[PDB]
């Protein structure tokens, strides 16, 4: 009776009530989700704001037992997670204001349109269409008005509402003893009171500062065989001493360099592997794909699919009125109830999205067993990690050769693995400079280092600084150019694409050792091996009961994320590039500009 | 036996019907029962206990378990004598906006001791300061309701249980 079974005894009502309210609302989402009408609608509304209100009459309950009383963990855990005042600390007007500013912006966002300048009446949107212009075309003027004009037409409506954003923010963020909203954010890797697993709020950007140095090395050698590249399809516009123009990167915003690789492949004589043709000669229909997911996964030692998961999944496309959501997602309901929704194609993308999305259901299922609240990854970035590792595992020559889609004999040659390897870096690698030097911006601005007058000037000198790209037209203080991508202007935290990229690689080199591999550590598949898949299941089993730096030691070793795995998996290719820049000029110069002459 | 072994109705767990009895052969070939582990063997006359548990629960009604079943609802002595038997009724016992006439107890001041029925209703009292017959804070009701649906997997499910005693 002292402090602590009176909490216990709350959080089991709490547990109870929650579990059936939030099925409740999740089989309402899903139910309009794979069937569109105006009734459903209202049907998924009510249990939506219903589950809301209840969420918030129990946290106003759960303030009146003092936390620095409580002596257990895991009633700490949930009692802090469940006290979080959020918003509705401001005012009625300051709240009221934040959230219209809010759908504001993601209305400007979703619905702003740019038209030609030659005839007005020809607008089209950012999603089908000028997306696609970024993606596929290569004319230098085509791509650069739509550079220009996007952030010219879209991102000077979203200035005068982001520099209030920021206000509001900061003040709701300081009214709950955090120090700003960048604080906030970080406020996820956080773990006190453990006595060997600690890890402060502002230990989050050292270690990613210092895990940042060590990946110069490749970025920059990447970056200039991508420049002495692209220097031969737009001539005399790439100076081989500068950086690279911001609007030739491969879409909207350089997030991704895939797009290049028509331009910059190795060895352009040698076609990659691609089984679709071997599927379609099988019959291999949008249930066999399932069916061998999940035969790869149960080989490992995890479990079968509920039974459950087969009759109400949504696997292929409907019939003729029942219009959908074609998103690959995986379905949590809750009370045991797990499904998968997405409109699988008989192609090779859909047999890798396959098993990605039933690693997410396997995780779903591995910790269902722990309180409500304690259902999550350990952070941010674990969920995506344990989701991506499959999707790589199961790509490889090894695996397709033994499932039946490639013929037994057909060796592959070291080009073919280069070609591989690249395909891999442009996208994995040639996004972390850009992810880091955003979210440094964000935290910086949040912080107040960076006064609203010069915004614009910072952001462009730390592209020019740290990602190695010059904007090819200047951009004075009424532009707003982080605004015109997705999570700036839908407020969602950026750091986890960061994280995950560094678990991924170090859960895939923890469990390749294990299953006693031998050759590159591209080339590792983890199927018919158990100690992996234990390896693997002594931490999905945990969830958030545990902080996330012993869940890490679980698997790997150590209590950080570390850096070396991902320069092990990019070896072979790291020597080929250093190879094959004998005679370019490794680096950049941040003065010159396609403007300054 | 014919009466509660197929009846249309059930019993709730912290409400169980008993019946003091004044052919075995026949239960076996029929419904999966899905469990059939007994104890008491591999008399004057029986009584027939039933209920309606959940899945995930059923391993629960045994000699020397820990749970809000064999602390608050049904527990068995020691050196039981009859035995046990559980099988699924998903079909006949769930509804789409879930059946909430299956309740239990998931609050008390005491363990139950063997072979005993708690009925009673009184408000739980958690805090110190006295609560006097109104919910609220620290103080709750004690009787919830399982949301029985068909859309749930193997474990939250409704099970029938019914249990022979020996003497
Ligand atoms: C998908 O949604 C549509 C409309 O929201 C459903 O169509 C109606 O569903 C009700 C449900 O009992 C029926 O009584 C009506 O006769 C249906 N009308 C038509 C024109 O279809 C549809 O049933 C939903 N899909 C499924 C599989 O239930
Ligand atoms: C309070 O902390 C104790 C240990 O610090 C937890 O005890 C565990 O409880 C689970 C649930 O019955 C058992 O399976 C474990 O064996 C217990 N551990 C030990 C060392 O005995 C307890 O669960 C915590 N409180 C709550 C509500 O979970
Ligand atoms: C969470 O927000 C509330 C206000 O919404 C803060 O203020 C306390 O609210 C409780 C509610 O019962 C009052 O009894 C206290 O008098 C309020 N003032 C205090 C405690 O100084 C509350 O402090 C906030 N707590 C956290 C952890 O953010
Ligand atoms: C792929 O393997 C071939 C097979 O050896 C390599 O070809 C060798 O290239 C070196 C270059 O210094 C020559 O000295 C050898 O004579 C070549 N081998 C033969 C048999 O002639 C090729 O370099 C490899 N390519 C990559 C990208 O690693
Ligand atoms: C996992 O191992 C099993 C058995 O070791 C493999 O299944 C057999 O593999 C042999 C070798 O090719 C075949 O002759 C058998 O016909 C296979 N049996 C079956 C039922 O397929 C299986 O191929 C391995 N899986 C992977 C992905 O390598
Ligand atoms: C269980 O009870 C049901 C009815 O509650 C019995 O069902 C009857 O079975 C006989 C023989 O198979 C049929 O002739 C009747 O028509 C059935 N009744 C109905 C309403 O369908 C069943 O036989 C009982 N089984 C046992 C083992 O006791
Ligand atoms: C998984 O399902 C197959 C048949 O679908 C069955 O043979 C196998 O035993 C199941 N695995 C487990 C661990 O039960």
């Given amino acids: 009776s002292t402090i602590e079974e009176q909490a216990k005894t709350f959080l089991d009502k709490f547990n109870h009530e929650a579990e059936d309210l939030f099925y409740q609302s999740s089989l309402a989402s899903w139910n309009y989700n794979t069937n569109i009408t105006e009734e459903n609608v209202q049907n998924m509304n009510n249990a939506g704001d219903k589950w809301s209100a209840f969420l918030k009459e129990q946290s106003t309950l759960a303030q009146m037992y003092p936390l620095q009383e409580i002596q257990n963990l895991t009633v700490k855990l949930q009692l802090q997670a469940l006290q979080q005042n959020g918003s509705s600390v401001l005012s009625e007007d300051k709240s009221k204001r934040l959230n219209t500013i809010l759908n504001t912006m993601s209305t400007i966002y979703s619905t702003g349109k740019v038209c030609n300048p030659d005839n007005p009446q020809e607008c089209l949107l950012l999603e089908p269409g000028l997306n696609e212009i970024m993606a596929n075309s290569l004319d230098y003027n085509e791509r650069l008005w739509a550079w220009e004009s996007w952030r010219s037409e879209v991102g000077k409506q979203l200035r005068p509402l982001y520099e209030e954003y920021v206000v509001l923010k900061n003040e709701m963020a300081r009214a709950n003893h955090y120090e700003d909203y960048g604080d906030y954010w970080r406020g996820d890797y956080e773990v006190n009171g453990v006595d060997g697993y600690d890890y402060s709020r502002g230990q989050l950007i050292e270690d990613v500062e210092h895990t940042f140095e060590e990946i110069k090395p490749l970025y920059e050698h990447l970056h200039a065989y991508v420049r002495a590249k692209l220097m031969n399809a737009y001539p005399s516009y790439i100076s081989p001493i500068g950086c690279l123009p911001a609007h030739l990167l491969g879409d909207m915003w350089g997030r991704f360099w895939t797009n290049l690789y028509s331009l910059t492949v190795p060895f352009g004589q040698k076609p990659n592997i691609d089984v679709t043709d071997a599927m379609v000669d099988q019959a291999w229909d949008a249930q066999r794909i399932f069916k061998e997911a999940e035969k790869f996964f149960v080989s490992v030692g995890l479990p079968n699919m509920t039974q459950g998961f087969w009759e109400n999944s949504m696997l292929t496309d409907p019939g003729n009125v029942q219009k959908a959501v074609c998103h690959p997602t995986a379905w949590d309901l809750g009370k045991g109830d797990f499904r998968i929704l997405m409109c699988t194609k008989v192609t090779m993308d859909d047999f890798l999205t396959a098993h990605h999305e039933m690693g997410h259901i396997q995780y779903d299922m591995a910790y269902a067993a722990q309180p409500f609240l304690l259902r999550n990854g350990a952070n941010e970035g674990f969920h995506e990690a344990v989701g991506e590792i499959m999707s790589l595992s199961a790509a490889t020559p090894k695996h397709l050769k033994s499932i039946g889609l490639l013929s037994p004999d057909f060796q592959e040659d070291n080009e073919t693995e280069i070609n591989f390897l690249l395909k891999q870096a442009l996208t994995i690698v040639g996004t972390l400079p850009f992810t880091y030097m955003l979210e440094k911006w964000r935290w910086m601005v949040f912080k107040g280092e960076i006064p609203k007058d010069q915004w614009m000037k910072k952001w462009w000198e730390m592209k020019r600084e740290i990602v190695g790209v010059v904007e090819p037209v200047p951009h004075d203080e009424t532009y707003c150019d982080p605004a015109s991508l997705f999570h700036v202007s839908n407020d969602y935290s950026f750091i986890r694409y960061y994280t995950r990229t560094l678990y991924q690689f170090q859960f895939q080199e923890a469990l390749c050792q294990a299953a006693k591999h031998e050759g590159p550590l591209h080339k590792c598949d983890i199927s018919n091996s158990t100690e992996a898949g234990q390896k693997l299941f002594n931490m999905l089993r945990l969830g958030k009961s545990e902080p996330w730096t012993l869940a890490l030691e679980n698997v790997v070793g150590a209590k950080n994320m570390n850096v070396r795995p991902l320069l092990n998996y990019f070896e072979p290719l790291f020597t080929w590039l250093k190879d094959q820049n004998k005679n370019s000029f490794v680096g950049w110069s941040t003065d010159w500009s396609p403007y300054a002459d | ?167």
């Fill in chain 2, 1 to 167: 036996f014919d009466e509660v072994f197929n009846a249309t109705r059930f019993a709730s767990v912290y409400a169980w019907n008993r019946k003091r009895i004044s052919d075995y052969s026949v239960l076996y070939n029929f419904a999966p029962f899905f469990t059939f582990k007994c104890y008491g063997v591999s008399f004057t006359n029986v009584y027939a206990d039933s209920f309606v548990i959940r899945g995930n629960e059923v391993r629960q009604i045994a000699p020397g378990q820990t749970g809000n079943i064999a602390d608050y609802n049904y527990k068995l002595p020691d050196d039981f004598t009859g035995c046990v038997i559980a099988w699924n009724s998903n079909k006949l016992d769930s509804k789409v906006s879930g059946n909430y006439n299956y309740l239990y107890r998931l609050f008390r001041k005491s363990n139950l001791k063997p072979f005993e029925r708690d009925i009673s209703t009184e408000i739980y009292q958690a805090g110190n300061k006295p609560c006097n017959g109104v919910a609220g804070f620290n103080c709750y009701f004690p009787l919830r309701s399982y949301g029985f649906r068909p859309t749930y997997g193997v474990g939250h499910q409704p099970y029938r249980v019914v249990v022979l005693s020996f003497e």
